[PDB]
Amino acid sequence: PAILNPIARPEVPQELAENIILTSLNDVYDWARLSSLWPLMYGTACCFIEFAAMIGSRFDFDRFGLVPRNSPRQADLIITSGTITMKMAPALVRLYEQMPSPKYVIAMGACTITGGMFSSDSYSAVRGVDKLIPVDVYLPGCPPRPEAIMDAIVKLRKKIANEHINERGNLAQTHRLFTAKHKMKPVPPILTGQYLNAPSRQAPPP
Amino acid sequence: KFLNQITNYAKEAVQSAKYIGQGLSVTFDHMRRRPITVQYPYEKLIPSERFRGRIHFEFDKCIACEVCVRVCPINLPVVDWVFNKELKKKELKHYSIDFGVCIFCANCVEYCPTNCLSVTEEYELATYDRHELNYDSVAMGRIPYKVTQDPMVTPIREFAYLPAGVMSGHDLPAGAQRAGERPEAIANTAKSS
């Protein structure tokens, strides 16, 4: 109990590389990667609109190479814009894990870094996305000026330019997985088609 | 019976061709106009006079009445007072605001009685660690950014500070004023006849 929430204090110090050729090639590996980030077209709530304003002509993130992508397979950056309720939290983790490994996260708006104005007396909003996925950059503010989203992009580019090709080991998932039988009465799914063809829609009960 | 159908087909096809040619001409015209893009990192857009940025806190003016905590939508500002016993004076020990939870509605700045709390034009907050967004009583003053006093940024006014008739703020002279006269000037003119 000396220091609560302690740190690792690891061993086997770095095993990093030094020769000029490999670091010069790492320079290109990191330049190609940070100057062509493709965000996922993913909005949930208010902040998305400012993100869309960041797409528009008034100031587009097309420069420094950002092209919004629809499927997560081609996306390498998810700018989480909007409040994430408990109904949709697993719908985000999925979209995050369903997306190639050299990937990044930006939590924009107050509702994705601490819960925001809903951090009190709300029973459905996830109080920050940092408890769902590994956020890289936080920008505060109900809807942040779309030249603050670009400031977050600057601070994310200067973080991407830091990576090391001799360090991509800290990029896989360890998968410490277990198993335990249960007895819990599987129920039928209550979410199917059958909205207008349902028998209760066609005639009132006697 | 069959000729009317064909004349309708022709009147539809030629119309669809003209209404594509017109759009083609409009788009080919659009690429002559100057881009409205505000090239942010080197052309930062100077904010308004009421823009609600980061909160600024003057430790010396605070009297610890906690109205900032009371009119806050989420009771955010942490105020730690101790109530010294000289005669009745409250003493401030730590004022803070978690700007990660902040909403930037500035109700706190509206109801500060002592003008101890103000808004700024710092919209460029971003960190790698949200625990670094909790501002001490000292990290809050810090003399705001002032985009204009930046050697690598050409400030660009927004639509409300451009002279009459002007729409964009890119190719602007060095002597423009907002839109009209201020009240003191109008009163001075009315003073002389």
Place this chain on the structure above:
Amino acid sequence: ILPGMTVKVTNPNDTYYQFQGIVQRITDGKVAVLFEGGNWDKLVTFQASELEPVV
């Protein structure tokens, strides 16, 4: 130019031209002027040369 004084802004190339405020804090040669007006007290930093200590 000292804190607490009421000042005006004399710089035709600024959005806060001919505004009047009160000096809240001065550090490193630059000042911070608070314009109490509208609804939310604004605070912006000016150089020591873009002011004038109005009486």
Place this chain on the structure above:
Amino acid sequence: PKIETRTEPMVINMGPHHPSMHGVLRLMVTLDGEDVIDCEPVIGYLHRGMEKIAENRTNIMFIPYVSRWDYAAGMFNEAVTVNAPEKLAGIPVPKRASYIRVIMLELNRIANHLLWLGPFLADVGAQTPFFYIFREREYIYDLFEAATGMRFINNNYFRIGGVAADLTYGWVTKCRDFCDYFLPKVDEYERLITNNPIFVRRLQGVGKISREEAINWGLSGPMLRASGVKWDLRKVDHYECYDDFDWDVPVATEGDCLARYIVRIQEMRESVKIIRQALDGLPGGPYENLEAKRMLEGAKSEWNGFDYQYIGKKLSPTFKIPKGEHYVRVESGKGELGIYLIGDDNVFPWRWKIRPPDFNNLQVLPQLLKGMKVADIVAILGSIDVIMGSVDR
């Protein structure tokens, strides 16, 4: 590795990840060969609990919250939130504040219709107009950011006894400039678009509600006025400073996506008339003129009167709304907003309920998809102007 085709109705999930601006909506839809048998819309992916929050926040603490139900225009819902306790307390709003409120609501209606118009034209065509609305939608952002603190939503510019503060100095002239620069383009839209025969046959007869079924299904918005009902809460309720301006409540008769588009464009065009008619008639005119008159003679003169103030008496954050329920309403961009405030004796209300227009216009998604096509799903979605922020309550 395959999907094993079989002769059944196929169910497809246009799930929460909509790569568009139509919020988060799931829409499990089944189809029999490029038709629609029935769809089950799964709303709720943005329910943050505004109704339970409103019961625990005082009014000025809750007024920043409201700018979220139906993002866009984040001043309609501010207007109804201000009107709710204002009516119970019977607090009189001055006329200048009423004119500023009218101007803000009309600019917000224009912005709402622009935000609806962009992705609508995108889903029935090209992606360039999305870059044109946001060139035209920014000129209103930059007017809000002068008047109130921020851009669109999180303005909290409204107050119970009026409006948080007067306009800036060079504001009326610049709003005039914007109106004169924008009014030709609401018609330039119908010039560059709305006449492509392929584009008008696309939404010619897809989506349809009879006048007698839109009343039954409660489609308060322009979805009603597109079905031949000359009825908007601005002329039937005599909203605050109306009957002081000319009125052409636009209505179509067929009740289809094309009718919705036409009504929305004519309404966006009438909003500019309302704004230009109010601007020339503020109780005090532009704020620099009013301030000059007040500093020249308004020490005691009539220019310092109650009818020329931006607010009534400034109220404490402990307003303590009185006892007694009632239902308030405002004709927003998507139709009628409704707050069924109750209140018992204190600052915290009792059952602050929100009646959003999109929540009722969305009830006929299945009826409007009664076997139309698989392709006109997005057009019917865009014809309703769905905003999931107003589908949380």
Place this chain on the structure above:
Amino acid sequence: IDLQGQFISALQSLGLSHDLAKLLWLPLPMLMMLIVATVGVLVAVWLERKISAAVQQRIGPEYIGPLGILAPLADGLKLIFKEDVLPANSDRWLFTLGPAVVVIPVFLSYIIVPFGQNLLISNLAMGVFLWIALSSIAPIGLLMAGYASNNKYSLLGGLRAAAQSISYEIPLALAVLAVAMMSNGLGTVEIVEQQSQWNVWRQPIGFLVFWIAALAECERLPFDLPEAEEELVAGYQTEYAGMKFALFYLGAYVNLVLSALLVSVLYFGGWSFPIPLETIANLLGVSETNPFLQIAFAVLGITMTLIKAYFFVFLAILLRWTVPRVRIDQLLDLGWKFLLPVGLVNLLLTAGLKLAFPVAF
């Protein structure tokens, strides 16, 4: 000059089995055309991103290189280093093969792109007909990308892609048919040498049909159905991540520079600075063995080919942001209901005019 003559002669001067020298030269043009195709792809990506920005009062990539010149390089190198995913129950071998079958025959059709006479890889006797035959393998690639997926989202996209690429193959062939009627043959050099003083002025309907059919090869926003983001997420591409997706991203712009060059050579001509240049006997140049005049006219021909290829690349990526999309059924009515009848009519008209007035045809 005849660089081939000099190469084979200087290589045979030191022995090396003269017949073997001719085998040691094939890689030279076989990779010069690869170089120009890759540069054309980079140019097409850059032009799209920088012209769509000008059309919309915007600025394209500007922080990559001086003018965003390095933007396609970055977008390619990123997709190289990206982790590739192969979903749970998808097939393992038709997956990694779709994006290659949709690409190999698009590259192979560069045999027939002239860039001036004696400046092309092996002017073939089948020429444009070989291209018509080779452009029919990509639908197999799309069906392969759709069949090898556990995603019913993307099988429906592969089907509607393979059903659009076959709808615009009959009119695309009936336009080249009318061109080959006048051209007396099928080889591209023999097709273009009939312009000795342009086919667009005598085939004003076949030009329209050819151009529309080529733009409707699942390429441009006029159609681009399997890429139409809003109606469906990327169609069949929705599951490819690294270089496998870059093969789609790349095989769609090379399939555009190719079509631009082909419209140029069919209806305009990769030669002929408009005046009948080869009647520049007024400078008394002995072209025949003029050591230069040869290089001067080579440069003129290359420039005149690239001008008219860039004209159509520009016009295609301009129509992308001008013409509204059609659902899928307004698309399949262009072919088989408007383009196929008009193609047949143009063919019959060219036949009637060639039988009646054999001069000028």
Place this chain on the structure above:
Amino acid sequence: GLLAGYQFVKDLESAGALALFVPPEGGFEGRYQRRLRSKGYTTLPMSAPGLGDLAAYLTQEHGIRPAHTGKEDIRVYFQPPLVTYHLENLPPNAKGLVLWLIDGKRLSKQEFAYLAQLTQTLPKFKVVVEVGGDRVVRWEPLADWVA
């Protein structure tokens, strides 16, 4: 000159506190941090606008007060010194610990002088402060650039 050697690390080891002048696009200074990290130095960037006295946060302890929002009456945390705690948690063969400050423009000349002086004492501790500026990634000792 489009590719850099290791002069940055030598200059940091010599001066102790540098003051970068990165271009305002932020993708061309990360390679210098990677050069630093490849030598043995460990970095930790903490976005200067958000630290306190810079002496209570770096050297001494300081009581962080989290955001109670109506619940959970005021509580302090006392997080350990952001430097003395990271000098103990260095990897086995670590050449030192350099401190990266992203938005150095917000600090004042007094705080810059303090950060410069702190490098001489407290041995295994260098400082880089990205004061905004020039269109090329140039550096300059932090003892200079002030007064």
Place this chain on the structure above:
Amino acid sequence: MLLKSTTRHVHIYAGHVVDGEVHPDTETLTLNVDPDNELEWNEAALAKVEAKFRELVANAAGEDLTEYNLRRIGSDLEHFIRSLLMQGEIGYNLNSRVRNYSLGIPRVNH
């Protein structure tokens, strides 16, 4: 279809991972503590977490297999993980990854 409770450093599913897939089963309740390696683990701590998971899935379960109950189990597992991290049995990773202290900052236990 799967039924899962996926949060940071806890991932409960309703199937059996045979080689990397999931294969919904209706009684396996797999668990995937800390995939992204926010923390550094030991052999004793992982055993404690597995034991807690077992006594949480077995000793208290006769209810439905709705996603509500799966979330209710995952929440308790994550509270247990946070308690382990508070007591000091485990610690943050400190590696060159994102390093955002999602479970709290290090404090000094005054």
